[model samples]
Target: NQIDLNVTCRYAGVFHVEKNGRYSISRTEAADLCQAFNSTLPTMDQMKLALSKGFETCRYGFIEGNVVIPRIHPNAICAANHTGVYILVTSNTSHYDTYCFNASAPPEEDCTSVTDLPNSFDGPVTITIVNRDGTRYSKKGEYRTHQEDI
Candidate 1:
């Protein structure tokens, strides 16, 4: 018996930055910024950037003449909150995965998926992974890291 499963996945929202200098923005703030800008929330590329920089997701209220831009990584979050701007690095999982498994057979499907951190962006944020069986893994920084590094 062939079980055909039509699985549909949707991005509830993209990542976004607020129109203020508030670096402590939340998911709500990011969503609002995306709406105000008439753009989809940050794509995977954007999320990766924010994660790499160590920015915790939070809601930031807009201030006059200030624009909140979404970035990947908590590191960027620190930089943005402190300096009001920062640099983001983009990563392509497809290329990296393909290269890593060059000698082996490619998997039927890609393993890259949107991963969520256990904690939210409150005060000093720390990221750790909780397994389905309740196993906890501490990351180097407060965000996602390459599998090899873990």
Candidate 2:
């Protein structure tokens, strides 16, 4: 059976969705939460691409490689006057929202779908990865090695 992936994928592109509250989701929970929203955790590049398109949020979110909070405008509480994808240093168990990547195109009837995606980090950050058993492991890397991983 050829299932169509378009129905649920009506909404496309990178999105920053707030969870129940600010910093309310752990790394693994963030991924699963995005999936529940018909999206996936964005890769480092994808997050940047969204930033380049003028996306910004005061809330921190989980992206590939690390947690990042984007800032486009200068704000006292938002990235502390930064104007870029701000890499965050915090605990993996800590809570945060999520940056989701939704495919731009709806899948074909045969279910074959593909598209381009932009694809970073720095500073004593934690890298969390989900295992086959659904557990998560974290590692520390140099500042902004989210860029390195990218």
Candidate 3:
């Protein structure tokens, strides 16, 4: 029997937590952010594709291997739902590792703020992924004290 193994990439974007605590994304900033994953800036089409797919917010990451693609690299995917933003910190991997955040829900005014974090008690967050082979990866991000600082 053939096992239809599926692999999905995951990612998280770190932004400075503004004094008031808010998150934002800009074209240029997004591009620089993509570089952390070793991915080129996502074109307008790619961004729209993500938005159309109900992705409200997320980091960025890639997939390794699966039934469809034996070995997929930089396969960008979502990491968290729109209502919540993901925060991760790591110091042991290359800057080109695959990462992603999930935006599975609609956008909200403060959905991406730490004040409204889904896991209120999760503590300082870190992005992480476990490959099908049990390989793990993670990274840390700097949080700004104010939204404007991000």
How do all the candidates rank in terms of lDDT, highest first?
2, 3, 1
lDDT of each: 0.28, 0.54, 0.29
TM-score of 3: 0.24
Lowest lDDT 10-residue stretch of candidate 3: 63-72
**Candidate 2 local lDDT, 54-95, one digit each (tens):** 667777778877888877888988877788889887554666
Clashing pairs counted in every model: 25, 14, 32
Candidate 3 achieves a global lDDT of: 0.29
Best-fitting candidate, scored by lDDT: 2
Per residue, candidate 3 scores C-alpha lDDT tens digits across 26-123 of 33333343343334433333333443443333333222110011111223453322222222334243222222233432332222322112221222
Lowest lDDT sum, 10 consecutive residues, model 1, at 94-103
Off by over 4 Å in 3: 1-21, 24-30, 58-150
TM-scores of all candidate predictions against the true structure: 0.21, 0.57, 0.24
Best by TM-score: 2
Q: Candidate 2: TM-score? A: 0.57
